[PDB]
Amino acid sequence: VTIEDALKVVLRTALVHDGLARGLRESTKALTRGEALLVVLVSSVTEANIIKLVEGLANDPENKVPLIKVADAKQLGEWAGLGKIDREGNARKVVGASVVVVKNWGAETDELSMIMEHFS
Amino acid sequence: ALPEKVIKAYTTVGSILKTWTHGKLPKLFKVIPSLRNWQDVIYVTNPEEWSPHVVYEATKLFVSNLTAKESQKFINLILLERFRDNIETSEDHSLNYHIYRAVKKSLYKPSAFFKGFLFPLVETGCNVREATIAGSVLAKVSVPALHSSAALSYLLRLPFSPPTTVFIKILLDKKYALPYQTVDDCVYYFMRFRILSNGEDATRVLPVIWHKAFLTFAQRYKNDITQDQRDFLLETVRQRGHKDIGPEIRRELLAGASR
Amino acid sequence: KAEVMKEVIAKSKFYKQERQKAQGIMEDQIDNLDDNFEDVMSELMMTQPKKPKTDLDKEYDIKVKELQLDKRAAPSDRTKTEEEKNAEAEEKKRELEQQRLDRMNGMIELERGVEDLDDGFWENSISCPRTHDALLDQVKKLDLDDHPKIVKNIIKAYQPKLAEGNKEKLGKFTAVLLRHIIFLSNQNYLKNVQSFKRTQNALISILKSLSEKYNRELSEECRDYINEMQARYKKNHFDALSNGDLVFFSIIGIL
Amino acid sequence: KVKLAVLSYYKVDAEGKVTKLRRECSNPTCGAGVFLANHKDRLYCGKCHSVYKVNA
RNA sequence: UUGUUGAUUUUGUGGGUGGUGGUGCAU
């Protein structure tokens, strides 16, 4: 089980309990409120200051939140559930997500343990 | 208790809502959703005494501003009871035009609608007249497929009642792209009325609305079921088919291909 | 009766004025509250109270996401019986025929008459080719028998539902296709008359589908060719006339 | 239209510290992360619809 | 897209629908 595969289920589990903040504006609102438990950020964001802002908010001394890097925004959006499913079952009309923040895990899974263990 | 100066002011507001028909709503009224204790402020405004025009505008105001959870409470406590109150107390047991719109504006938030009117109503002794009026509101307004399918799945698992059978027919009439899980939930609901060990649903008399609902399901979703499900549904017509609707159901079901 | 009517009118005016006075009072009452709005809110803000989902609710949020995962069925309208379909067809055959006989008799659809026209007449991935040349370049490397495949593929790639503006492209393509059908006939085909026959009729069939929805585009192009034919006949006489010209008149008869 | 409105609302220095140039909403119900729409004469809350002074 | 909000809408192309419709009739 890879770390990326661990995040794929974890984001899906967070979706089931409405525990994800999807997008920058929702992500920063979560981070400023202290509601963020994990931040998933895309490394390939065209605008650098987006990376600087999320990294700064995630690294704030009062509320340190773990941060993860994702190669492509499109796959992060798919994990966030933005994309729709086609008759073949493949994700279609998917929307890219630059940043996704988890407000509630929902269910305690073994895959959550690896992610926090990796951070620890 | 709220501040005493506030109480008089919102008591004054409540008087306006009694006779308010048009114009601008009081600015104090418009800012209630932002307040944490909107319920307490809402009670002093006497929601039962709100005019039908106020109920329409208040629902616009609160559904848009309040959160999904808080909207559900505003939904469940005020507009649902007013909906039931108006039908019961009206001479012809009809619903006011403004209240009728107020249900539509609540549909803009599908989740808070379903958990605040539909499921509470059908689970709290909904009558045939109530289901017809609510079903008409459901039929005309566009609802998302995802929320509708979840709503359809909930109703199908509930104990059979003619009022619930209506809503099942409305959702099936909506001609949605039901997920196959919902299609199986639909098929599961219709099998349980066959005689086999089985519950009373096998021997319970089935009104026309169920047959129309069962004819309703077959017309679109004949191509979205497996052969085994098709064979099971065919047995339902043989055992529990209607005199005139039943042959039609068998024709539609046989005409469908397997998924 | 008159005294009854006057009493009715006075009562209606009385109630109308009473309603108007009530409205006047309501507006003033609204104004006063807007004036004390700040004081009332400030007291509410100070008294603001300090900072689990139902199991019934907990299930629903799970459903929508599971439904989000599960594939979605397509809906199908009720199947009409053979008698109704046969019944439905025959009136349309009749209606077109009763419309047909009217147009035989002078009913012109702007339902005016021909006599109206007779007033003052004597007294005075896949690319959609917008032009005929563009289509040839796309089909330049393709064999003669392969033209229907590419032409069909262009229609599928640019259906109206796929994107906005596809209707004009296909309509322009309708004009383009007609010129190609006429163009091929001008080209020598004695070598592979069979292959030409299998492309030529197929392209006409596609135009028949295109004409059914892109008439105005086709009719405009058809009129343009007629003017061009007349202009060429003006200078070349019979030399202007060609096989595709004969074909062109035949296709108009089809469509 | 507004594009990357989050970019302007939050400013980052070279050090990376995050600074807020737009005041938070005073209403506890709105919570943190809510910024007031800024105008010369007064400062306005979109969610609550309250009006605050720029000086405050 | 809502009125700040978050996918509930908007756009283009197709497209089913008379129905909080009445009136009498047969336990």
From Swiss-Prot, chain A:
GO biological process per UniProt: cytoplasmic translation; maintenance of translational fidelity; maturation of SSU-rRNA; ribosomal small subunit assembly; ribosomal small subunit biogenesis
GO molecular function, one term: structural constituent of ribosome
Functional summary from the UniProt entry: Component of the ribosome, a large ribonucleoprotein complex responsible for the synthesis of proteins in the cell. The small ribosomal subunit (SSU) binds messenger RNAs (mRNAs) and translates the encoded message by selecting cognate aminoacyl-transfer RNA (tRNA) molecules. The large subunit (LSU) contains the ribosomal catalytic site termed the peptidyl transferase center (PTC), which catalyzes the formation of peptide bonds, thereby polymerizing the amino acids delivered by tRNAs into a polypeptide chain.
Record key words, sorted: Cytoplasm, Isopeptide bond, Ribonucleoprotein, Ribosomal protein, Ubl conjugation
Compartment(s): Cytoplasm
Protein name per Swiss-Prot or TrEMBL: Small ribosomal subunit protein eS12
Protein family per UniProt: Belongs to the eukaryotic ribosomal protein eS12 family.
Gene coding for it: RPS12
Highest taxon in the source lineage: Eukaryota
Parent-protein start and end of this portion: 22 to 141 of 143
Keyword Glycosyltransferase: no
Swiss-Prot record, chain B:
Gene Ontology annotations for the cellular component aspect, listed alphabetically: 90S preribosome; cytoplasm; nucleolus; nucleus; preribosome, small subunit precursor; small-subunit processome
One term of GO molecular function: snoRNA binding
Presence of keyword Nucleus: yes
Compartments where found: Cytoplasm; Nucleus, Nucleolus
Keywords: Cytoplasm, Nucleus, Phosphoprotein, Ribosome biogenesis
Modified positions (Phosphoserine) in chain numbering: S197
GO BP, one annotated term: rRNA processing
This protein's record includes keyword Repeat: no
Domain of life the protein comes from: Eukaryota
Similarity-based family: Belongs to the bystin family.
The protein's role, per its UniProt record: Required for normal export of the pre-40S particles from the nucleus to the cytoplasm. Its subcellular location and association with pre-40S subunit shifts from mixed cytoplasm/nucleus to all nuclear in RPS19 disruptions, suggesting it acts after the ribosomal protein.
Leftover remarks: Present with 21600 molecules/cell in log phase SD medium.
Annotated protein name in UniProt: Essential nuclear protein 1
Organism: Saccharomyces cerevisiae (strain ATCC 204508 / S288c) (Baker's yeast)
Lineage: Eukaryota, Fungi, Dikarya, Ascomycota, Saccharomycotina
Gene: ENP1
UniProtKB/Swiss-Prot annotation, chain C:
TM stretches of this protein: none
Region Disordered, annotated ranges: 66-98
Localization terms from the record: Nucleus, Nucleolus
Superkingdom as given in the UniProt entry: Eukaryota
Annotated function: Involved in nucleolar processing of pre-18S ribosomal RNA. Has a role in the nuclear export of 40S pre-ribosomal subunit to the cytoplasm.
Family: Belongs to the NOP14 family.
Record note on quaternary structure: Interacts with snoRNA U3. Interacts with EMG1, MPP10 and NOC4. Component of the ribosomal small subunit (SSU) processome composed of at least 40 protein subunits and snoRNA U3.
UniProt-recorded name of the protein: Nucleolar complex protein 14
Source species: Saccharomyces cerevisiae (strain ATCC 204508 / S288c)
Organism lineage string: Eukaryota, Fungi, Dikarya, Ascomycota, Saccharomycotina
Gene from which the chain derives: NOP14
Swiss-Prot record, chain D:
ZnF (C4-type) ranges: 25-48
UniProt-annotated location(s): Cytoplasm
Chain positions of cross-link Glycyl lysine isopeptide (Lys-Gly) (interchain with G-Cter in ubiquitin): K11, K17
Region forming the signal peptide: none
Phosphoserine PTM sites in chain numbering: S26
Subunit structure: Component of the small ribosomal subunit (SSU). Mature yeast ribosomes consist of a small (40S) and a large (60S) subunit. The 40S small subunit contains 1 molecule of ribosomal RNA (18S rRNA) and 33 different proteins (encoded by 57 genes). The large 60S subunit contains 3 rRNA molecules (25S, 5.8S and 5S rRNA) and 46 different proteins (encoded by 81 genes).
Task performed by this protein: Component of the ribosome, a large ribonucleoprotein complex responsible for the synthesis of proteins in the cell. The small ribosomal subunit (SSU) binds messenger RNAs (mRNAs) and translates the encoded message by selecting cognate aminoacyl-transfer RNA (tRNA) molecules. The large subunit (LSU) contains the ribosomal catalytic site termed the peptidyl transferase center (PTC), which catalyzes the formation of peptide bonds, thereby polymerizing the amino acids delivered by tRNAs into a polypeptide chain.
Protein name: Small ribosomal subunit protein eS31
Organism: Saccharomyces cerevisiae (strain ATCC 204508 / S288c) (Baker's yeast)
